[PDB]
From Swiss-Prot, chain C:
The keyword Transport does not apply. The keyword Repeat applies. This is Capsid protein. Disulfide bonds: none annotated. It comes from Hepatitis B virus genotype D subtype ayw (isolate France/Tiollais/1979) (HBV-D). GO terms for molecular function: DNA binding; RNA binding; structural molecule activity. Signal peptide: none annotated. The chain holds residues 1 to 150 of 183 of the full protein. Keywords: Capsid protein, Cytoplasmic inwards viral transport, DNA-binding, Host cytoplasm, Host-virus interaction, Microtubular inwards viral transport, Phosphoprotein, Repeat, RNA-binding, T=4 icosahedral capsid protein, Viral penetration into host nucleus, Virion, Virus entry into host cell. Belongs to the orthohepadnavirus core antigen family. Homodimerizes, then multimerizes. Interacts with cytosol exposed regions of viral L glycoprotein present in the reticulum-to-Golgi compartment. Interacts with human FLNB. Phosphorylated form interacts with host importin alpha; this interaction depends on the exposure of the NLS, which itself depends upon genome maturation and/or phosphorylation of the capsid protein. Interacts with host NUP153. GO terms for biological process: microtubule-dependent intracellular transport of viral material towards nucleus; symbiont entry into host cell; viral penetration into host nucleus. It is found in: Virion; Host cytoplasm. Self assembles to form an icosahedral capsid. Most capsids appear to be large particles with an icosahedral symmetry of T=4 and consist of 240 copies of capsid protein, though a fraction forms smaller T=3 particles consisting of 180 capsid proteins. Entering capsids are transported along microtubules to the nucleus. Phosphorylation of the capsid is thought to induce exposure of nuclear localization signal in the C-terminal portion of the capsid protein that allows binding to the nuclear pore complex via the importin (karyopherin-) alpha and beta. Phosphorylated by host SRPK1, SRPK2, and maybe protein kinase C or GAPDH. Phosphorylation is critical for pregenomic RNA packaging. Protein kinase C phosphorylation is stimulated by HBx protein and may play a role in transport of the viral genome to the nucleus at the late step during the viral replication cycle.
Amino acid sequence: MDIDPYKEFGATVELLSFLPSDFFPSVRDLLDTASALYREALESPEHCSPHHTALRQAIVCWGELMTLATWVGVNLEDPASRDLVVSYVNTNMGLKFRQLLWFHISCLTFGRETVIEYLVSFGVWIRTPPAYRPPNAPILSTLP
Amino acid sequence: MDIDPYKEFGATVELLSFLPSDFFPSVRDLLDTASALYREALESPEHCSPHHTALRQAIVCWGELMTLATWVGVNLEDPASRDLVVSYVNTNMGLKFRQLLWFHISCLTFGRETVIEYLVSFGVWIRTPPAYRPPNAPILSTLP
Amino acid sequence: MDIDPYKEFGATVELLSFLPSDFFPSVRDLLDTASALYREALESPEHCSPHHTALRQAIVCWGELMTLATWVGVNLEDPASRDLVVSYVNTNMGLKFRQLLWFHISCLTFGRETVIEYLVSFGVWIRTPPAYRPPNAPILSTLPETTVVR
Amino acid sequence: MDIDPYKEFGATVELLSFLPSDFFPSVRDLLDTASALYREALESPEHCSPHHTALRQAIVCWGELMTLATWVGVNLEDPASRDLVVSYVNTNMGLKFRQLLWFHISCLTFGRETVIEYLVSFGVWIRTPPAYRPPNAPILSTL
């Protein structure tokens, strides 16, 4: 239906592909971050924010995807092909799920506008030659 | 996280268990209903509602599950296990997806209060033994 | 006709003749930057700014150059000559296209006066011998050099 | 990006496709006209108009395409292949350029409204079967 999960939040898949795929933290690290920071609000019966809603739906999505993959792996008999399918699922869906988690957690934690500024700035940075840019990479921080 | 995608709205996976699994329309029918009624809002850059947000996320998740299953089947060469895995996918994930789509499209069309009262009344109807069960089951409708 | 594409914006080829080719990101990097930052406006039916106009025109003719060079290389048979013509097109036209894209993007981002002041200072720096100039070139960035967003 | 260089003005590549390819004057003719009529404004340090901006960019990048094609043909071993490459560059890049120059010069000279109405009228004229097609093809004119 030509739906972009970010354009209601002011971002785009083009803007999140503006960053390297090797930048987004792992899905385990991000789920741990969520469980630590916003578990009581995600398990809550409240529309605390569209970020909370999308994060809930995304977590359930990953649950279903992992269930399917684990089931077919259990039912299959070649670890080689199991490795192939897990490589595919990671490379394709795992990156998209990491971008979805990162975006929403970072939004809740810092600011939607701050996260978009960070996207564009880090893109321009990693694209600019080192000798003519700030030497240390940008980073989001709550500590003043 | 033990997230329930319905208590954020006012329902639960045990309140929707009042409806059987053979009650929910096909994913094709429900996606057609969506494309017909709320495409302009699902493709919109606005948080028109939590129902819209959840429906977008779910549609994307379904596109993703179908991508995975299609890639798998295509890389596969045996028809029996392929039909078996697609049957498992349909049953489990398609049923959860149908529940989600039905709930959200109905809460957008008829209202959440009406949908929950309908769930309660249909639970009464389907619990009533058939000998004392009226034939005119409850149905969501804007007309008499 | 002896036209200067930057004279309309207050710069010149002599003011950008100092920036080395080591200074401008790749054409793909700059095109991705544009597609991510100002796509909604470059694909718009409005004259949002002369920078947008020039950027659209530059992107179009760069695509034209690329079609030409691709067709030529494909119709050539020796990879030696293919890479020779590719190196020529890079060193000659890609540098100018990166120059233009950088100028316009950096203008739209920071400010025309800011970009021109940066060019003046970078010229002062790159004209100065290394034994007498600081080792860290001047920098144009939307961030503080601490690079920590809060 | 799907940039259309005429959209910011009000035309499209499907509106200029109304005019054939053999309709647009030669790059030499259009450059001579541009010089004679707006040299002082194209060499000027002013955003005199988006038409001026686009025309400057076009002229410069065409000079660049010409440098590339000249260098290629020179370093090319066979003049018979030089003719092939010059034919290709003309057919594609030269035609697209003569459409870009014509559009902008004709706008800057007569009016963007006039140029778009002329595109529509020429579409009518060229769609009309010849038995009922006037020989007086539409033409842009001030007097």
